[PDB]
Amino acid sequence: SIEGRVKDVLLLDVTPLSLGIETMGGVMTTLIAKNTTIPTKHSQVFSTAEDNQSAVTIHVLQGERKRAADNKSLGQFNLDGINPAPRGMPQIEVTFDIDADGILHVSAKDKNSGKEQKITIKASSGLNEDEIQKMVRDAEANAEADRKFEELVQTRNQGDHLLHSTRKQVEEA
């Protein structure tokens, strides 16, 4: 109570903080949330708003929700190179089954040829609600640097199905 139930693993032996993807504009959307008891199995199909079958970013974000101090690392990778078919499809089904021991077996399965990548990434708890709000200071203020990446997003929000995703590493600098 007094609004502060970010962490809750006592009578919830579940996916322990809510964990999905860093989203459009320094936002966080969970993929599977607490109340889903391990071992879990659940499908959520996604697409992108730009470059559909060419790069999904698999930076899975374990944190809270809209105010992005929700940067518990559940990754930072990218499923790249799914043939040239950019912007909108929308057929990349992403299934996330966690095991009972605690590992997110999530396969971003693409519907171009089943170009998939199954990561097995940890999800251990052991932190605080002001690990998130303590990251509202250090890191909610660092989300202004993510505002530069919100220009890279193209600035929007929500992202139901659509979900911007592109890496950046040119040779010039």
UniProtKB/Swiss-Prot annotation:
Q: Tell me where in this chain the PTM N6-succinyllysine is found.
A: 122, 148
Give all N6-acetyllysine modified positions: 41
Q: How is it modified after translation?
A: Autophosphorylated; GrpE inhibits the autophosphorylation.
Membrane-spanning segments: none
Q: Where in the cell is it found?
A: Cytoplasm; Cell inner membrane
Report, from the record, the phenotype seen after gene disruption. Non-essential; synthetic lethality is seen in a triple tig-dnaK-dnaJ disruption, although this depends on temperature (triple disruptions grow slowly at 20 and 34 degrees Celsius but not at all at 43 degrees) and strain background.
Q: What role does it play?
A: Plays an essential role in the initiation of phage lambda DNA replication, where it acts in an ATP-dependent fashion with the DnaJ protein to release lambda O and P proteins from the preprimosomal complex. DnaK is also involved in chromosomal DNA replication, possibly through an analogous interaction with the DnaA protein. Also participates actively in the response to hyperosmotic shock.
Subunit annotation: In pull-down experiments interacts with CedA.
Q: Which family does it belong to?
A: Belongs to the heat shock protein 70 family.
Q: What name does this protein carry? A: Chaperone protein DnaK
The record lists the organism as Escherichia coli (strain K12)
Q: Which gene encodes it?
A: dnaK
State the covered range within the intact protein: 387 to 553 of 638
